[PDB]
Design a protein around this ligand. Sequence first.
Ligand code: HEM
Length: 116
Amino acid sequence: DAMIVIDGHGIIQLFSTAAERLFGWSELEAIGQNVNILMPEPDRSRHDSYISRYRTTSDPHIIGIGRIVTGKRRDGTTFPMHLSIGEMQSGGEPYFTGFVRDLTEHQQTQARLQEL
Ligand code: HEM
């Protein structure tokens, strides 16, 4: 679904059209903001340390692995999403690209079948 590109400081550089629909923020609004605006606490307040931690230790926890986490929309509603992260460099600086897959439907179907 969504594609997001951030610098080594967690600041959003590129925000795809699909991401706009998924998170509710427009491209102009999102750009120049910390990526932590797309997640809820406690991850939100710790995301910078997550990046900092990786930039020094170089031990990936999601990069090359992938993980299912909770995303937070503009209207405050949260949702499950699969997150894949890629590391790249441009202009001698590190950039991270995140590919997001909305799993809202999957989760709803699973809960529904469990309820019946
Ligand atoms: C919107 C929901 C998101 C949540 C809830 C989330 C959550 C997390 C978590 C839990 C970690 C640390 C994992 C651990 O310590 O075990 C992490 C690491 C990281 N996040 Fe996010 N994140 C989200 C989106 C993104 C996006 C869109 C990017 C942008 C490309 C991103 C880039 C990173 C980077 C670079 C790391 C460190 C590299 C690594 O640990 O492999 N995150 N994030």
